[PDB]
Design a protein around this ligand. Structure first.
Ligand SMILES: *[C@@H]1O[C@H](CO)[C@@H](O[C@@H]2O[C@H](CO)[C@@H](O[C@@H]3O[C@H](CO)[C@@H](O)[C@H](O[C@@H]4O[C@H](CO)[C@@H](O)[C@H](O)[C@@H]4O)[C@@H]3O)[C@H](O)[C@H]2NC(C)=O)[C@H](O)[C@H]1NC(C)=O
Ligand SMILES: *[C@@H]1O[C@H](CO)[C@@H](O[C@@H]2O[C@H](CO)[C@@H](O[C@H]3O[C@H](CO)[C@@H](O)[C@H](O)[C@@H]3O)[C@H](O)[C@H]2NC(C)=O)[C@H](O)[C@H]1NC(C)=O
Ligand SMILES: *[C@@H]1O[C@H](CO)[C@@H](O[C@@H]2O[C@H](CO)[C@@H](O)[C@H](O)[C@H]2NC(C)=O)[C@H](O)[C@H]1NC(C)=O
Ligand SMILES: *[C@@H]1O[C@H](CO)[C@@H](O[C@@H]2O[C@H](CO)[C@@H](O)[C@H](O)[C@H]2NC(C)=O)[C@H](O)[C@H]1NC(C)=O
Ligand code: RET
Ligand code: RET
Ligand code: HTG
Ligand code: HTG
Ligand code: HTG
Ligand code: HTG
Ligand code: PLM
Ligand code: PLM
Ligand code: PLM
Ligand code: PLM
Ligand code: PLM
Ligand code: PLM
Ligand code: HG
Ligand code: HG
Ligand code: HG
Ligand code: HG
Ligand code: HG
Ligand code: HG
Ligand code: ZN
Ligand code: ZN
Ligand code: ZN
Ligand code: ZN
Ligand code: ZN
Ligand code: ZN
Ligand code: ZN
Lengths: 348, 348
């Protein structure tokens, strides 16, 4: 056999030399140099040290500034929360695991690592549809007088979690399972074994369809609509109203946010689909480690896009960080937002 | 003319089309795509969001743990502090500047961005000599009963800032000057123009010798001395004493620290030396941008080497992060301590 299937796992290493051991019982240093595990460990350490502050800081700003309540502000507040979950929820285990070379917490550690990474990713993917829709509603404006309220945003948010819980919780209760991958320091869905006892093959299809191909079709199709109407071609002050101009900024970011999701997940999903369609073939530990641990950056790239592609949000942050206020930058040249300062309501 | 010299700058772009404008007065979007400035803008954001926690942590752990007071301990606290300066002193403006496309804060910002970036870089170069010496004094011990104590370290520390300020301060008071480089989003020493009115051509030769060639000669030399004695080969617990085998690791770190320094600064120094000897020649904005924004990682690669190459520091760190004790691991093995818990001394 090309690999060592265990009842709980599937090590991508032949056991001809009988040197293969359960990644829930002993170091996997026989799969790769030990330094490389340190590598992974130093990596998760840095990601945690970047992901915590960047996502908490986002969370804290969105709240503090009572005027940041656009559907986007809700969605990115939702992501920052999911990213904190990814950090303490699973990165903490994936760091611990890397340090020891194996899932010392056994299948639990594997479930924590895998669950939160999946939850993290699906919430992102599903938050992208909500943005794709919202963006469609304000650019191709399906209604004549429709305007999303905080209520609607709270809907989109609750939605992304129902969807995300949908494919990330089942593997905890019998439908498929989380199993170590690559060097065995991370956990993903089971694409490796057919394990009928838990219906692995049906769950992988369901997942690749309902939680990948469909959300992308929607996301890509919607874009084919905001091709004729609002286009990346953005100018200076006003564009058909400074309001229209600023509507163009949010869309650029939402597009960029997609490219960012794709870069971060196609490589993982790709290798995932490959194996699924080549179970038992001869692949090794590094095959899925690289995409797997690269995708963990998904826990931080969103807030950074937000802060670099949103004049408003960026300033509230400076306003927050500079304790008092004095939001240098260049403001939004438009509305602002905060708590005691200029969070003054400015309607009609 | 290949570039556009202003009385204050030197944009590496022709003004044949008359689209060139002072990097102190308007976006340089005509030098490179605006998405590229956002890319730099992001990059600095991450550096700031990583270099801050990691350097503050290094600082806080050293201070808090009493046994952490060897010469090395002294130096890397220095770095952690020089790094904190690079981040808040200069990175902050380079971030703001990149977000805007030019130095909205004019030459003050150029001086801020440039000064601190040099201060940091030079402090790190001199501290590599201090280490070079200390390493020599302990491996080729040309002394009889001379111990390189804290008093010496606090010396070699003040020393480094006296040298660093030596080349980092003059451009602020008439000798040479700081000026935008590459995409005009970071500042450096004037290698581009002769500006006799400020003696650029002399300050550069001074610098490339007093604060580059010399230090490197000494450091590369002190590496020659410890060629016969301590080497790269270091067995397990002990080699001629575990104390003799424990010093061979601080040496292997000091060497890695230098390798890292060279990778971070040779490219830049090189590009800089090339331009100084090809002023007016036809180079573009990306030419200096790539090496220039890469040497900025200088603000964070040190605390990383340290946490991965110094068992003692590492363990003391985890102790601090695990609040109380929970040293878990396998303890330093030799010495340990903290703020109070294991702070218990056992010297001589
Ligand atoms: C590259 O080649 C360009 C084409 O020849 C050349 O264009 C000249 O650019 C300057 C500015 O860079 C123009 O002069 C400005 O004119 C405006 C009037 O619209 C003034 O407002 C401005 O001065 C003001 O001064 C105020 C007080 O100091 C200050 O508050 C304002 O902000 C502002 O600075 C300038 O006088 C000039 O008209 C342009 N000439 C032509 C024919 O277009 C570029 O200068 C040149 N770029 C280089 C060499 O860097
Ligand atoms: C790869 O081949 C290895 C050699 O055949 C094989 O090692 C075997 O590991 C089991 C662990 O389950 C050992 O069995 C021991 O199990 C418990 C210990 O927890 C106790 O009942 C006894 O100590 C018992 O011996 C086998 O002894 C050992 N066989 C050997 C080395 O001869 C691995 O299990 C294989 N890896 C796979 C397929 O997962
Ligand atoms: C073990 O791995 C090898 C290589 O991945 C597999 O060999 C391939 O087998 C398929 C048929 O299943 C052929 O189409 C390929 O041409 C073979 N490639 C090579 C390099 O021989 C082998 O099938 C695997 N063993 C199993 C089934 O577990
Ligand atoms: C403008 O830049 C060009 C390119 O760097 C310079 O042209 C070079 O000039 C040197 C000396 O005059 C020659 O040895 C090279 O062969 C030239 N490069 C080539 C092959 O084109 C030019 O000197 C610069 N001129 C200005 C305005 O300073
Ligand atoms: C390090 C841990 C990782 C990368 C675990 C991920 C698990 C998992 C099942 C992820 C699935 C997917 C996404 C999230 C994004 C869309 C594509 C999927 C279905 C491959
Ligand atoms: C982003 C800011 C940068 C790269 C500024 C650097 C400024 C400067 C004058 C640096 C000089 C040097 C060092 C520091 C290291 C050794 C080599 C020098 C002399 C090129
Ligand atoms: C970026 C998307 C990546 C898509 C996944 C392509 C996997 S490709 C796969 O890799 C194996 C590694 O052992 C090779 O042995 C095999 O020949 C090759 O076809
Ligand atoms: C965090 C990575 C972001 C880098 C990707 C930039 C994509 S695009 C970039 O976005 C800026 C902010 O809205 C705009 O001002 C600018 O005009 C636009 O070209
Ligand atoms: C170790 C890194 C040192 C880098 C110094 C090499 C500079 S190389 C120099 O660059 C000019 C501008 O692009 C070109 O026009 C020219 O042809 C090329 O030789
Ligand atoms: C929480 C901060 C993360 C830094 C990681 C510290 C790894 S520390 C490492 O751990 C090994 C076994 O667990 C011990 O045997 C060894 O002595 C210890 O230095
Ligand atoms: C189109 C692309 C969007 C690209 C964005 C970049 C911003 C992302 C952050 C990546 C985290 C990298 C972590 C460093 C770990 C060492
Ligand atoms: C869009 C930009 C991606 C930028 C990314 C990351 C930059 C940061 C990390 C530097 C840590 C280097 C580690 C020291 C190892 C020697
Ligand atoms: C409210 O306005 C406080 C601002 C919050 C940002 C943090 C600013 C830190 C100040 C820089 C510290 C200099 C480093 C010194 C190291 C010894
Ligand atoms: C205003 O005073 C100038 C802005 C200075 C801000 C410096 C940026 C440092 C970012 C650190 C924030 C970390 C967030 C902490 C989360 C717990
Ligand atoms: C001990 O109690 C185990 C818990 C330690 C925390 C988990 C490791 C996270 C990586 C460190 C990043 C912390 C960021 C704050 C730096 C000042
Ligand atoms: C002092 O000992 C405290 C160290 C910091 C605690 C970090 C320990 C990691 C535990 C996992 C995080 C809990 C899940 C929360 C998800 C939001
Ligand atoms: Hg869309
Ligand atoms: Hg990514
Ligand atoms: Hg704001
Ligand atoms: Hg030396
Ligand atoms: Hg470097
Ligand atoms: Hg300690
Ligand atoms: Zn089973
Ligand atoms: Zn889902
Ligand atoms: Zn199958
Ligand atoms: Zn601004
Ligand atoms: Zn002058
Ligand atoms: Zn100097
Ligand atoms: Zn010259």
């Amino acid at each position: 056999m090309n690999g060592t299937e265990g009842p709980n796992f599937y090590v991508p290493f032949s056991n001809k030399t009988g040197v293969v051991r359960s990644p829930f019982e002993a170091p996997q240093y026989y799969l790769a140099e030990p330094w490389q595990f340190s590598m992974l460990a130093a990596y998760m350490f840095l990601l945690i040290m970047l992901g915590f502050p960047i996502n908490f800081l986002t969370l804290y700003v969105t709240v503090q500034h009572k005027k940041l309540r656009t559907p986007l502000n809700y969605i990115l507040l939702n992501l920052a929360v999911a990213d904190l979950f990814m950090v303490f929820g699973g990165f903490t285990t994936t760091l611990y695991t890397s340090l020891h070379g194996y899932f010392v917490f056994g299948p639990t550690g594997c479930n924590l690592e895998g669950f939160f990474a999946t939850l993290g990713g699906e919430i992102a993917l599903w938050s992208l549809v909500v943005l794709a829709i919202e963006r469609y509603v304000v650019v191709c404006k399906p209604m004549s007088n429709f305007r999303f309220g905080e209520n609607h945003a709270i809907m989109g948010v609750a939605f992304t979690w129902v969807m995300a819980l949908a494919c990330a919780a089942p593997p905890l209760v019998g439908w498929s399972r989380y199993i170590p991958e690559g060097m065995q320091c991370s956990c993903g869905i089971d694409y490796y074994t057919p394990h009928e006892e838990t219906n692995n093959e049906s769950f992988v299809i369901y997942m690749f369809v309902v939680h990948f191909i469909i959300p992308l079709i929607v996301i890509f199709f919607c874009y084919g609509q905001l091709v004729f109407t609002v286009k990346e071609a953005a100018a200076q002050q006003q564009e058909s109203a400074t309001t229209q101009k600023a509507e163009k900024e949010v869309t650029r970011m939402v597009i960029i946010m997609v490219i960012a999701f794709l870069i971060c997940w196609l490589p993982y999903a790709g290798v995932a689909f490959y194996i699924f369609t080549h179970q038992g073939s001869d692949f090794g530990p590094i095959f899925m480690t690289i995409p797997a641990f690269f995708a963990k950056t998904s826990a931080v790239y969103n807030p950074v896009i937000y802060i670099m592609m949103n004049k408003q949000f960026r300033n509230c942050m400076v306003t927050t960080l500079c304790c008092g206020k004095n939001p240098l930058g260049d403001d939004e040249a438009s509305t602002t937002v905060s708590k005691t300062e200029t969070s003054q309501v400015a309607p009609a």
